[PDB]
């Protein structure tokens, strides 16, 4: 369908116990393809899927030099933020950025992303029109005035519309077997009666990709309630994901309700009921 | 593929 590529930087100051720590990770869709960790021996953009290992010597040396200079830049970025917030150096802080781009089935460019968070909060993000920034506070405003004078957005747009897309298409084509697959969800139902008066109905989606799912309980027609609970989608660790949804009910009342699964894979959205 | 230039805050 439409696919995406996101890199995620994370820098964390370590007053007294060295220079800050930089960790970056690459993803296409819900599938991680590289990693760099500044504390590691290797000092290199390392591969993280068996399909990205086929890219030639140049790719590795190129990517290492960049993610290495990404780290020296987000290093000094922590230093500036300190000063913008007049915070004491003895304190430890966290700068995360996230960027990347998206394409349709036409393989054509769709959306860019370029966002920063300081200490777990939005700082500055490039609008979907890629000419402007949203500043979260009056320090971001300082950044927003420099970046508008610099013409950062015009330059970053060129990267996103260009090298970012080019990258993504190659990965979708070298990695087609992995990245361009739908794994349908395997769906079973457990029942654990809490007492003789009431029982628990758990709706299981296992071993499906990508992560996006919508699991919906209902009784005798439509039912959306906080009587229902959902655990956040979790990774199985083999490249598929898991989710379960539970609902509680009276006894001998198990067929009044059904569970409904939507996923990219399934030609038809399913229904699940309890057989003793 | 990565960028070759990153903004300063």
């Amino acid at each position: 369908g439409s696919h995406s590529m996101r890199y995620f930087s994370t820098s964390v100051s370590r007053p007294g116990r060295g220079e800050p720590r930089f960790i970056a990770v690459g993803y296409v869709d819900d599938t991680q393809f590289v990693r760099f960790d500044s504390d590691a021996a290797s000092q290199r953009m390392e591969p993280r899927a068996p399909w990205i290992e086929q890219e030639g010597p140049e790719y590795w040396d190129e990517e290492t030099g960049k993610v290495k200079a990404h780290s020296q830049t987000d290093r000094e970025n922590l230093r500036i933020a300190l000063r913008y917030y007049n915070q004491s150096e003895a304190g430890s802080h966290t700068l995360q950025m996230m960027f990347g781009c998206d394409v349709g089935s036409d393989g054509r460019f769709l959306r860019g992303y370029h966002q920063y968070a300081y200490d777990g909060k939005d700082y500055i993000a490039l609008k979907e029109d890629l000419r402007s920034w949203t500043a979260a506070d009056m320090a971001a405003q300082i950044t927003k005035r420099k970046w508008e004078a610099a013409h950062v957005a015009e330059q970053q747009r060129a990267y996103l519309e260009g090298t970012c897309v080019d990258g993504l298409r190659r990965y979708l084509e070298n990695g087609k077997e992995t990245l361009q697959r739908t794994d349908p969800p395997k769906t079973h139902m457990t029942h654990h009666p809490i007492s003789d008066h009431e029982a628990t109905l758990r709706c299981w989606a296992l071993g499906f990709y990508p992560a996006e799912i919508t699991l919906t309980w209902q009784r005798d027609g439509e039912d959306q309630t906080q009587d229902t609970e959902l655990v956040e989608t979790r990774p199985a660790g083999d490249g598929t994901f898991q989710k379960w949804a539970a609902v509680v009910v009276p006894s001998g009342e198990e067929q009044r309700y059904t569970c409904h699964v939507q996923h990219e894979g399934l030609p038809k959205p399913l229904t699940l009921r309890w057989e003793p | 593929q990565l960028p070759r230039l990153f903004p300063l805050l």
Epitope: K66, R157, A158 | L5
Partner: T-cell receptor, first 111, second 111 residues
Framework: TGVSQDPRHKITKRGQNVTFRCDPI?????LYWYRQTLGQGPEFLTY????????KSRLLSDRFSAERPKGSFSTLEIQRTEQGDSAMYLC?????????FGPGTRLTVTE | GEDVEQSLFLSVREGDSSVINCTYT??????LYWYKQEPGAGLQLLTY?????DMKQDQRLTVLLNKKDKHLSLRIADTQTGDSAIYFC???????????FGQGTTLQVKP
């Protein structure tokens, strides 16, 4: 406004030492030195991201040293100046991608 | 490995269109400059295009880019004897914002 550079001309004896100054445009975190010999286009020397000297060249010898203490003005010491180093020593500064150049220091090294 | 190639010298008549091409080194370069040097010391930014643009007009200046061929060209529609100077095309290189320059095209304009 515009980048500044001391001094705009320099004459040294061969093997004396020489220091150029460059003040970039206010609030410009990136600073680059180039040299250019007449007839040619400029060759990159060294790069500063505030106080930190993050790139140098094979070109740059033991003799060559640059410093940007305080993250502002930069210096370029050239030691044991041989005639070979007779050249225009240019300074550029940028908020992000756009470099603005100085008027440069024309250095003549004579025996 | 390789370098930003342009012509050393171009001659042209008052009111003709001067056209400096160069071929740059890497597709991934997001921006490309023309700088200008008159007789003296001052290297002055003229204009630049972004890699996601075909054309860019600016008074008498026009800039064309073909990313596929890594081909960049500067065009000057009426040409004056004042337009005479050295014209350098300049490409980013690596992960700094550092520039590699062409050898520079001298524009002799004939009365």
């Amino acid at each position: 406004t515009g980048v500044s550079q001391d001094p705009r001309h320099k004459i040294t004896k061969r093997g004396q030492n020489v220091t150029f100054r460059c003040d970039p445009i206010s609030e410009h975190n990136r600073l680059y030195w180039y040299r250019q010999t007449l007839g040619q286009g400029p060759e990159f020397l060294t790069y500063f991201q505030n106080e930190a000297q993050l790139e140098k060249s094979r070109l740059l010898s033991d003799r060559f040293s640059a410093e940007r203490p305080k993250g502002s003005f930069s210096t370029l010491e050239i030691q044991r100046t041989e005639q070979g180093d007779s050249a225009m020593y240019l300074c550029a500064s940028s908020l992000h991608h756009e470099q603005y150049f100085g008027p440069g220091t024309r250095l003549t090294v004579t025996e | 490995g390789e370098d930003v190639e342009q012509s050393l010298f171009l001659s042209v008549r008052e009111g003709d269109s001067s056209v400096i091409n160069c071929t740059y080194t890497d597709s991934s370069s997001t921006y490309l400059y023309w700088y200008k040097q008159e007789p003296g010391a001052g290297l002055q930014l003229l204009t630049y295009i972004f890699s996601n643009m075909d054309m860019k007009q600016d008074q008498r200046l026009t800039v064309l880019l073909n990313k596929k061929d890594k081909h960049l060209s500067l065009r000057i529609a009426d040409t004056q004897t004042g337009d005479s100077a050295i014209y350098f095309c300049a490409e980013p290189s690596g992960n700094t914002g550092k520039l590699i320059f062409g050898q520079g095209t001298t524009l002799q304009v004939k009365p």
